[PDB]
Amino acid sequence: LPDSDVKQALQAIPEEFRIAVYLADVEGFAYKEIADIMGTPIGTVMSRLHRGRRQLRGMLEDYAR
């Protein structure tokens, strides 16, 4: 999306969602591999990705002057 102003949006999000989002959307990991990394049910990984992307969307919307 924007610049690596991303590390900075992401850091504004709770740790749990932030890691799911970084791993999925910055690093390109598969939800099943992220479930291994995080040691959580894949369905938990998905729920954090949704909450996490929800917030994120909320920021780049604000970044519409």
CATH of residue 53:
1.10.10.10
Count of domains forming the chain: 1
Non-local CB neighbours of 26 within 8 Å, separated by 6+ positions: 6, 10
Q: What is the resolution of this structure in A?
A: 2.6
Pull the structure tokens for residue 59.
């920021």
Residue 46 φ/ψ, nearest 5 degrees: -80, -30
Give yes or no for a contact between 34 and 20, defined as CB atoms under 8 angstroms apart.
Answer: yes
Q: Which parts of 1-65 are beta strand (E)?
A: none
Which domain does 30 fall in, by range? 1-65
Method: X-ray
Pull the structure tokens for residue 21.
């989002």
